[PDB]
Design a protein around this ligand. Structure first.
Ligand SMILES: NC(=O)C1=CN([C@@H]2O[C@H](COP(=O)(O)OP(=O)(O)OC[C@H]3O[C@@H](n4cnc5c(N)ncnc54)[C@H](OP(=O)(O)O)[C@@H]3O)[C@@H](O)[C@H]2O)C=CC1
Ligand SMILES: NC(=O)C1=CN([C@@H]2O[C@H](COP(=O)(O)OP(=O)(O)OC[C@H]3O[C@@H](n4cnc5c(N)ncnc54)[C@H](OP(=O)(O)O)[C@@H]3O)[C@@H](O)[C@H]2O)C=CC1
Lengths: 1190, 48
C-alpha cells in the first residue's frame, strides 16, 4: 500500500515546485488531511497520481484515475517556531525501567499485529516499554521517517488488530529544525528522538509534529490464507482384519446383494448388475446375457462401494506410507499395471501429496493402447506416463526397476497368477514393494463374482483363495509384509522383494546415560561396510528411537538403519523376547522394515492420516451465535460459550436463561462485515462474538425478565447485572417482551432525557416503521405532540396509520427522497419542527437540519456521518438550536447513575401503558441464518426475533436451565484454576499465554531458567498483570523431580492446577559425526526427563488436571537431517503422552512444521497455529500434527 | 480558537457558543466530535 506520508511528500513537493522553493527550504503545514481510499501498488505496472492545489483556498487534492484519494489543506509555514518541537511533558515522568524494546522486538510485535515492514521502513532503533518514547533512524527519506512516527504511535495502542491512518488534524514540518535536532551515535548513522503523548495526542520526532492522528480498523482479511495440513499420528497394526466393519452402507449393500444371490434394487452398479442378471431368467441363465447388459459396459465395477471399500479406507494410506518409508532414496518410482480398469491412478497420487519432499514418477501401463484411451486429461493433470506392458509379457525395460508396483486386480483381469507375478517380480527392483488388491475366493463376495464373470476366464483366474495367494507369493519368492482384509472378503496384499541376506549389526539403545551414541557414531563411520545396523529398545516403553531413525535416514549412511521397539501400553500384556534365537527377531529381520514397533500383541509402525474435516460438537446449555468466517452469513453457527464456567448464584452476575433474543441493525452490520468488531465500545476479546443487544427469559429464580446487554445477547445464557433487567407484565408474552428494551430505552433517552420533549411540540421522527421510530412515535403521542414521520414505502404507511390512529393523512412523508423537507415546511407554516430524531444518510441529514425551528433540537442516532466526519454548517446555530449526539452504548461503559433515569422512565412507560411491544417475526434458533438473511433483505416491519427456547405456561418455573444443544466446541478455562507453561517466556510460550488469557485463565506460572531477560517479555508480563492476571515466574527446572514438585507446589498456592504445557526446548544441532553424548543429555533434559517428571508429579498431586500438552516437532516422525537428538526427545515425549491417554488421563502431543511470526514446509503464522491448537485440543486423539506445504 | 476548544471536550460534554462570528460566516464543524456524547449549543440571549 502507498503510505499516507507518501501523499504528504508528493503534495509537499508539488507546493515547493509551485512556489519556486526547494523541499528543504519550505516549512509547511498540513490541515484536515482526509484519506478516502488506499491505493494498491501493483507488482508490475505503475499508478499515476495527480496533485492539484488551490492557492486561494489553500486546499490540495490527490486523485487516481479520477477517484479522489486524499484531500486537505496545505500552505507554507510563514514563521516557524522551534518551540513547537520541544519534547512534550512526558505522560509518565519516571518509568524507571532499564529494559527497552529493541528493533527486532518492536517489529516482531508489529508483525504479530499484522504490519509487515521491510528494512526501508524499520526505522525504530529502540522504544520504551509503554511505547511513549524512542529513537528513530534518518536515512534522508521523509516517507520512511513519518511512517515510523505513525508506527511509534500505533505501537503503544492497546487495541489488537490492524489500524491504518484515515485523518490527521495538523502536520508541521521544519527542515531547519530537523537538521538541528539530528545527532549521530557511535556509528555513522543519524537518529532523532521521538515522543508520543496520548493525553495531548501529539507525536514529535525531530522536525515533524503530528497532531490529531486518527486510525480506523482495516478488515485484515487476506485472500488465499494458509491451509495447513492436519494429521493424526497413530499406531497401525501390520495385519488388520475386518477393516470396514463399522460402516453401514457397505453392510446394507451386501445384504441387498447376497440376498439376490440366494435363490439365484438400488443405485449401486454391482447390485444393478446382479438384478439384471436375475431378471432375464430365474433358472438356466445364459452366461453371455448376464455378462453383457446395458449400463454395465462401463468400467463402473471399481466405482461400486464394495470393490472400492478398502481403497477408500485408511488402509491404503497405511500401505502406501509404509512403502514410502522403506526407500533408500528420496524419490518414488510407481508403475501401475492394468491401469485402464484398475483406475488406481486417480487415487495414489492424491494420497502422496502431503509428503513435502517425496517426488514420484507415476506410470500407467495397460495391455492395449485403446484401453485407458479415455480420461487422458485426468492423467495429464497429474504427472503420469503411458505404458504398454501386458502382465503375461515380460515388463519393458522403459519401466525398468521400480520401487513400488500397484495392480488393483479386483477389477482388472490377470492372465495367469504365477506368470503375471513372475513378470512383476522380474520387473521389481531389488528390495522393492508389490501392492495387490484382490478378492479372496471362498468369501461371499468372491462367490458372487465367481458365479458372475464366468464368461471371461482371465478375470476368473484373478479370484483366488487366500491360501493360494500366500503359497504363490512363496513360489515367486516374494515376502509378505502386510495385509488389509475387509469384513466381506476384499484384501489388499503388500509384498516386498527379498534382499541379499547379510549379517546384521545389533546395538542396544536403552542406556540412560546416552553412551550408545559413541558406539553408533563409530559404526556408522565405516561407510565401506554395507551391513545394516538394527537399533533395538526393549528395556523401556518410552524410547525415542523412532524419531532418531527418522532423522538419521536423512544423514549419510542412513540407508543402513533399522529400528526395533517394545512399547506395550498395558502392563498386563506380556512383553515378547527379541533374543537372536527367538522367533520374533528373525521374523522381523526377514521383514526388513525400518519401523518395527510392538504394541499390545501386534507388530506395526506409526502412520499419518488426515483428521476428519468436520468441526467437533458437544451438547451444552451455553452457546452463542458466531460468524465463523467474517462477512459470510452462511458461516453462522452455534458455538460453545464461556458461560459454562459462570454461576447464577452471585447477585451481580445473575446468570439469566435466554428464551427469546432479538436482532438489531448493528448485528446485521457486524455479521455482514460492514461494521468492525472493534467499533463496539468496551474491552472485547479478539476472539468473541458481539451479536445481540437484548433478550427475554427466566431469571435464575424463574421470574421472567427482559434485559439489555452491550453485546453477546444472542445465546442460551447471558451474564447480566440486575440494573439492566425489567419484569414482563402478566399481560405480555415473552415473544413480545424481547422487542422492547433497546428501542424503547433509546427512544426515551433521546426524547425525554436529551430533547426534554414537552407537551404540544412538533416532531420529525425518521423511519417510523423501524423499532426506534415506532417507540418514538408512541412516546410522542402519549404527551400529545404533533409528529411527522417518514416511511419509505406504502405498506409501512398503512401499518403505521392502522397502529397509531391519531396520525393523520398529512402526517406522513417520503424517507427514500429528500422531499420531506417541503412537506414539513409547508404543513408547519415554515416555522419548522421543535425536535428531530434523525437516522438517515448525509444528504438526508443535511435536509433534516433545515426543518428545525427556533429553539430547535436535533437528535442524531445515526453513525455514518459521524464516523466519516462530514461537515456541519454552524449557521444553523444562529437560531438557538442544540445538536445532540445520542449514543446509548455509553451507559454500559459507565454512567450507571445516569442509566437509572432511563430505567425508571421505561418502567413508568410499562406501568402506564405507553410502552407497547412491537410486531415480531419469530425464527427458530436452528434457523438463525434465515433470520439474518430475512432482516438483511429489508422488508421487515417491527423486530425480527429468535426463539432460542419455547415458553412454558407456568408463571414461575423453579428450574430454568437451558435445554441441551449441540454446538461447536471451543476451549475455555475456569477462572479459579492455575496453568503452568514450562518455558513460557519463549517465542511460542508468550503467544500461548496470551491466547490462554483470552480464554480466562487468570493464574499463570511461566518457567524459564534465566528469567525476565528481554524487554518484550517484561512488556507482556506487565500488560497481563495490569489486566488482573496473577502472572508468576518460577525458575524451577523441570528436569529435576524436586524442581518439578516445587513448581507444582508453587502453582498450587494460586489455585488448583488446571493444565501444564511443556514448551522448554534446548537444541544442539549437528550431524551424528559431531554429536556427543553430552549434547544428547542437554537436549533431552528439558523435554524427555521434564515430561517424565511432570507426568509423575501430576499423577501424584494434580487431581483436577485437564490439559497436559507437549509441543513436539515435525522433525520427529517426518524426519530432518542434523537433528537426531531433537527427534529422539520429541519421540520420547510422544511415547509418554500416549501412555498417559491409555490410562484415562489427559494427554496430547502436537507436531509443528515451523512457526513464522515468533524441511520443505513454509513457516506458519501464529494465528493459524492458535486456531489449529484449539481444534487439536478439542479432538480425542493422542498425537496430532500441523504443517504448511511449500 | 473555536476548533481548538471543541477538542477540549469530554464524553458527555456540552459546548456553549455565545460568540457570533463563526456562526455568521457559517464555518464547518466536523461531526466526528459527536461520537463522544456531546451537546452543541447555540446560545443567543436576544431571543428572550
Ligand atoms: N443511541 C444510539 O446510538 C442508538 C442507535 N440506534 C440507531 O437508530 C436507528 C433506528 O433503528 P431501528 O429503527 O431499530 O432500525 P430498524 O432496522 O428496525 O428499522 C429501519 C428503518 O429505517 C429504514 N432502514 C434502516 N436501515 C435500512 C436498510 N439497510 N435498508 C432499508 N431500509 C433501512 C427502514 O426503511 P424506511 O425508513 O424506508 O421505512 C425502516 O423504516 C438505527 O440506525 C440504529 O442503529 C438505535 C438504538 C440506539
Ligand atoms: N519452529 C518452531 O517454532 C517449532 C518449535 N517446536 C516446539 O515449540 C516449543 C516452544 O519453542 P519456542 O518457545 O518458540 O522457542 P524457545 O527457544 O523460546 O523455547 C525455549 C523456551 O523455554 C525456556 N527454557 C529452556 N530450557 C528450559 C528449562 N529447562 N526449563 C524451563 N524453561 C526452559 C527458554 O528460556 P530460557 O533459555 O531462559 O530457559 C525459552 O523461553 C518447544 O517446546 C519446541 O519443541 C516444535 C515444532 C516447531
Amino acid at each position: 500500500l502507498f503510505p499516507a506520508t507518501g501523499y504528504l511528500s508528493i503534495v509537499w513537493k508539488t507546493l515547493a515546485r509551485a512556489l519556486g522553493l526547494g523541499v528543504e527550504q519550505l516549512p509547511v503545514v498540513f490541515e484536515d488531511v482526509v484519506l478516502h481510499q488506499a491505493t494498491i501498488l501493483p507488482k508490475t505496472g505503475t499508478v499515476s497520481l495527480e496533485v492539484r492545489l488551490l492557492e486561494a483556498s489553500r486546499a490540495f487534492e490527490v486523485s487516481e484515475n479520477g477517484n479522489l484519494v486524499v484531500s486537505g489543506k496545505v500552505y507554507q509555514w510563514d514563521d516557524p517556531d522551534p518551540r513547537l518541537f520541544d519534547h512534550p511533558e512526558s505522560p509518565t515522568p519516571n518509568p524507571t525501567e532499564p529494559l527497552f524494546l529493541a528493533q527486532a522486538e518492536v517489529y516482531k510485535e508489529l508483525r504479530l499485529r499484522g504490519y509487515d515492514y521491510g528494512p526501508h521502513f524499520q526505522g525504530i532503533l529502540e522504544a520504551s516499554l509503554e511505547g511513549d518514547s524512542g529513537r528513530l533512524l534518518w536515512k534522508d527519506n521523509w516517507v520512511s521517517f513519518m511512517d515510523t512516527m505513525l508506527q511509534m504511535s500505533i505501537l503503544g495502542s492497546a487495541k489488537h488488530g490492524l489500524y491504518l491512518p484515515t485523518r490527521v488534524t495538523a502536520i508541521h514540518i521544519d527542515p531547519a529544525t530537523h537538521r538541528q535536532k539530528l545527532y549521530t551515535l557511535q556509528d555513522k548513522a543519524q537518529v532523532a528522538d521521538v515522543v508520543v503523548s496520548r493525553w495531548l495526542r501529539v507525536t514529535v520526532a525531530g522536525g515533524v509534529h503530528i497532531s490529531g492522528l486518527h486510525t480506523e480498523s482495516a478488515p485484515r482479511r487476506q485472500q488465499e490464507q494458509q491451509v495447513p495440513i492436519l494429521e493424526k499420528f497413530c499406531f497401525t497394526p501390520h495385519t488388520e482384519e475386518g477393516c470396514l466393519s463399522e460402516r453401514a452402507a457397505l453392510q446394507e449393500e451386501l445384504q441387498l446383494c447376497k440376498g439376490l444371490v440366494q435363490a439365484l434394487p438400488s443405485q449401486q452398479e454391482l447390485p444393478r448388475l446382479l438384478s439384471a442378471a436375475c431378471r432375464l431368467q430365474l433358472n438356466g441363465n445364459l452366461q453371455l446375457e448376464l455378462a453383457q447388459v446395458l449400463a454395465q459396459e462401463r468400467p463402473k465395477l471399481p466405482e461400486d462401494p464394495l470393490l472400492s471399500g478398502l481403497l477408500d479406507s485408511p488402509a491404503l494410506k497405511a500401505c502406501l506410507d509404509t512403502a514410502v518409508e522403506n526407500m533408500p532414496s528420496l524419490k518414488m518410482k510407481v508403475v501401475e499395471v492394468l491401469a485402464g480398469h484398475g483406475h488406481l491412478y486417480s487415487r495414489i497420487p492424491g494420497l502422496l501429496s502431503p509428503h513435502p519432499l517425496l517426488q514420484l514418477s507415476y506410470t500407467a501401463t495397460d495391455r492395449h493402447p485403446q484401453a485407458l484411451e479415455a480420461a487422458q486429461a485426468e492423467l495429464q493433470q497429474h504427472d503420469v506416463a503411458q505404458g504398454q506392458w501386458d502382465p503375461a509379457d515380460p515388463a519393458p525395460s522403459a519401466l525398468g526397476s521400480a520401487d513400488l508396483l500397484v495392480c488393483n486386480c479386483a477389477v482388472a483381469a490377470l492372465g495367469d497368477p504365477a506368470s503375471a507375478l513372475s513378470n512383476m517380480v522380474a520387473a521389481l527392483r531389488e528390495g522393492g514393494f508389490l501392492l495387490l488388491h484382490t478378492l479372496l475366493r471362498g468369501h461371499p463376495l468372491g462367490d458372487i463374482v465367481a458365479f458372475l464373470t464366468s464368461t471371461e476366464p482371465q478375470y476368473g483366474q484373478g479370484i483366488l483363495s487366500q491360501d493360494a495367494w500366500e503359497s504363490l507369493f512363496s513360489r515367486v519368492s516374494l515376502r509378505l509384509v502386510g495385509l488389509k482384509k475387509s469384513f466381506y472378503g476384499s484384501t489388499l496384499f503388500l509384498c516386498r522383494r527379498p534382499t541379499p541376506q547379510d549379517s546384521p549389526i545389533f546395538l542396544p539403545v536403552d542406556d540412560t546415560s546416552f553412551r550408545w551414541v559413541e558406539s553408533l557414531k563409530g559404526i556408522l563411520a565405516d561407510e565401506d561396510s554395507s551391513r545394516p545396523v538394527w537399533l533395538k529398545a526393549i528395556n523401556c516403553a518410552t524410547s525415542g528411537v523412532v524419531g532418531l531413525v527418522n532423522c538419521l535416514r536423512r544423514e549419510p549412511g542412513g540407508n543402513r538403519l533399522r529400528c526395533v521397539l517394545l512399547s506395550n501400553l498395558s502392563s498386563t500384556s506380556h512383553v515378547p523376547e527379541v533374543d537372536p534365537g527367538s522367533a520374533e527377531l528373525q521374523k522381523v529381520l526377514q521383514g526388513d522394515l525400518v519401523m518395527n514397533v510392538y504394541r499390545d500383541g501386534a507388530w506395526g509402525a506409526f502412520r499419518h492420516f488426515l483428521l476428519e474435516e468436520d468441526k467437533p460438537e458437544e451438547p451444552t446449555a451455553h452457546a452463542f451465535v458466531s460468524t465463523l468466517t467474517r462477512g459470510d452469513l452462511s458461516s453462522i453457527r452455534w458455538v460453545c460459550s464461556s458461560l459454562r464456567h459462570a454461576q447464577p448464584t452471585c447477585p451481580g452476575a445473575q446468570l439469566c436463561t435466554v428464551y427469546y433474543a432479538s436482532l438489531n441493525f448493528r448485528d446485521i452490520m457486524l455479521a455482514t462485515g460492514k461494521l468492525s468488531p472493534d467499533a463496539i465500545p468496551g474491552k472485547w476479546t479478539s476472539q468473541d462474538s458481539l451479536l445481540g443487544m437484548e433478550f427475554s427469559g427466566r431469571d435464575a429464580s424463574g421470574k421472567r425478565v427482559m434485559g439489555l446487554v452491550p453485546a453477546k445477547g444472542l445465546a442460551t445464557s447471558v451474564l447480566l447485572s440486575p440494573d439492566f433487567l425489567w419484569d414482563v407484565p402478566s399481560n405480555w408474552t415473552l415473544e413480545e417482551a424481547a422487542s422492547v428494551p433497546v428501542v424503547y430505552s433509546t427512544a426515551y433517552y433521546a426524547l425525554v432525557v436529551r430533547g426534554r420533549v414537552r407537551p404540544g411540540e412538533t416532531l420529525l421522527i425518521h423511519s417510523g416503521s423501524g423499532g426506534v421510530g415506532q417507540a418514538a412515535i408512541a412516546i410522542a403521542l402519549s404527551l400529545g405532540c404533533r409528529v411527522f414521520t417518514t416511511v419509505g414505502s406504502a405498506e409501512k404507511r398503512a401499518y403505521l396509520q392502522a397502529r397509531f390512529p391519531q396520525l393523520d393523512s398529512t402526517s406522513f412523508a417520503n424517507s427514500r427522497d429528500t422531499s420531506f423537507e417541503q412537506h414539513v415546511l409547508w404543513h408547519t407554516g415554515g416555522k419548522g419542527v421543535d425536535l428531530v430524531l434523525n437516522s438517515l444518510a448525509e444528504e438526508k441529514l443535511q435536509a433534516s437540519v433545515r426543518c428545525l425551528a427556533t429553539h430547535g433540537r436535533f437528535l442524531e442516532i445515526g453513525k455514518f456521518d459521524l464516523s466519516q466526519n462530514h461537515p456541519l454548517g454552524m449557521a444553523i446555530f444562529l437560531k438557538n438550536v442544540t445538536f445532540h449526539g445520542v449514543l446509548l452504548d455509553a451507559f454500559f461503559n459507565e454512567s450507571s447513575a445516569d442509566w437509572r433515569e432511563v430505567w425508571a422512565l421505561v418502567q413508568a412507560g410499562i406501568r402506564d401503558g405507553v410502552v407497547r411491544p412491537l410486531k415480531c417475526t419469530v425464527f427458530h434458533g436452528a434457523q438463525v441464518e434465515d433470520a439474518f438473511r430475512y432482516m438483511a433483505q429489508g422488508k421487515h416491519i417491527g423486530k425480527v426475533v429468535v426463539q432460542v427456547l419455547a415458553e412454558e405456561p407456568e408463571a414461575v418455573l423453579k428450574g430454568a436451565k437451558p435445554k441441551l444443544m449441540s454446538a461447536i466446541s471451543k476451549t475455555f478455562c475456569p477462572a479459579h484454576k492455575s496453568y503452568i507453561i514450562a518455558g513460557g517466556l519463549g517465542g511460542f510460550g508468550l503467544e500461548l499465554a496470551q491466547w490462554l488469557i483470552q480464554r480466562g485463565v487468570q493464574k499463570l506460572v511461566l518457567t524459564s531458567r534465566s528469567g525476565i531477560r528481554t524487554g518484550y517479555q517484561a512488556k507482556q508480563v506487565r500488560r497481563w498483570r495490569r489486566q488482573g492476571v496473577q502472572v508468576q515466574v518460577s525458575t524451577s527446572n523441570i528436569s529435576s523431580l524436586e524442581g518439578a514438585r516445587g513448581l507444582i507446589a508453587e502453582a498450587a498456592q494460586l489455585g488448583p492446577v488446571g493444565g501444564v504445557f511443556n514448551l522448554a526446548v534446548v537444541l544442539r544441532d549437528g550431524l551424528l559425526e559431531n554429536q556427543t553424548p553430552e549434547f544428547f543429555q542437554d537436549v533431552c533434559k528439558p523435554k524427555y526427563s521434564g515430561t517424565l517428571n511432570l507426568d509423575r508429579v501430576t499423577r501424584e498431586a494434580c487431581p483436577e488436571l485437564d490439559y497436559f500438552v507437549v509441543f513436539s516437532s515435525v522433525s520427529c516422525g517426518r524426519g530432518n537431517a542434523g537433528q537426531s537428538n531433537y527427534g529422539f526427545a520429541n519421540s520420547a515425549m510422544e511415547r509418554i503422552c500416549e501412555k498417559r491417554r491409555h490410562e484415562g488421563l489427559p494427554g496430547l502431543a502436537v507436531q509443528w512444521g515451523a512457526i513464522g511470526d515468533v524441511s520443505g514446509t513454509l513457516p506458519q503464522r501464529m494465528a493459524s497455529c492458535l486456531e489449529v491448537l484449539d481444534l487439536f485440543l478439542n479432538q480425542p486423539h493422542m498425537v496430532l500434527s500441523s504443517f504448511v506445504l511449500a
